[PDB]
Amino acid sequence: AISFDNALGIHQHTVGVRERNAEVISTNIAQANTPGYKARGLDFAKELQAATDKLYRLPTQPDTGDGNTVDLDLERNLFMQNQIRHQASLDFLGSKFKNLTKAIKGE
Amino acid sequence: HPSRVFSMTERPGHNFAQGSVITTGRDLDVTIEGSGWISVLDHTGKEGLT
């Protein structure tokens, strides 16, 4: 054993997925006013399987002739949650090397 | 959820009740007693009721 795949766990992939998720939410907020755009959601378990997709969000309310299915209340909350979890993933993956370096150097 | 309902203003019809009659004593003044129309043709030529 003793390999980076096992030392880092899955925290090496989660940081990437949280970046992709943040990009999609940023797209949804920007495309909220453009008619005909369908809100895109990212399935977390899919990138989990890709580590070891880009779906559509069904609206809770009807459109108003635009056909745009973006709820700005939902997007802000989902962007806040993703950003908080992204920082935790950096903390988890960052400490993997800090412990790894301390084991090797002994100091 | 069925929460958004638009409303549009439209003309459902017209009021066809008899108008106010003005007695003028002029020979060439005519008013329709009760319901009825006068058929006339406009500038283009298409006939219509007045």
Automatic annotation (TrEMBL), chain A:
It is found in: Bacterial flagellum basal body. The keyword Transcription regulation does not apply. The keyword Transcription does not apply. Its main location: other. Keywords: Bacterial flagellum, Cell projection, Cilium, Flagellum. Structural component of flagellum, the bacterial motility apparatus. Part of the rod structure of flagellar basal body. The basal body constitutes a major portion of the flagellar organelle and consists of a number of rings mounted on a central rod. Belongs to the flagella basal body rod proteins family. This is Flagellar basal body rod protein FlgB.
TrEMBL record, chain B:
It is found in: Bacterial flagellum basal body. It comes from the Bacteria. Belongs to the flagella basal body rod proteins family. The basal body constitutes a major portion of the flagellar organelle and consists of five rings (E,L,P,S, and M) mounted on a central rod. The rod consists of about 26 subunits of FlgG in the distal portion, and FlgB, FlgC and FlgF are thought to build up the proximal portion of the rod with about 6 subunits each. This is Flagellar basal-body rod protein FlgF. It comes from Vibrio alginolyticus. The chain holds residues 51 to 100 of 249 of the full protein.
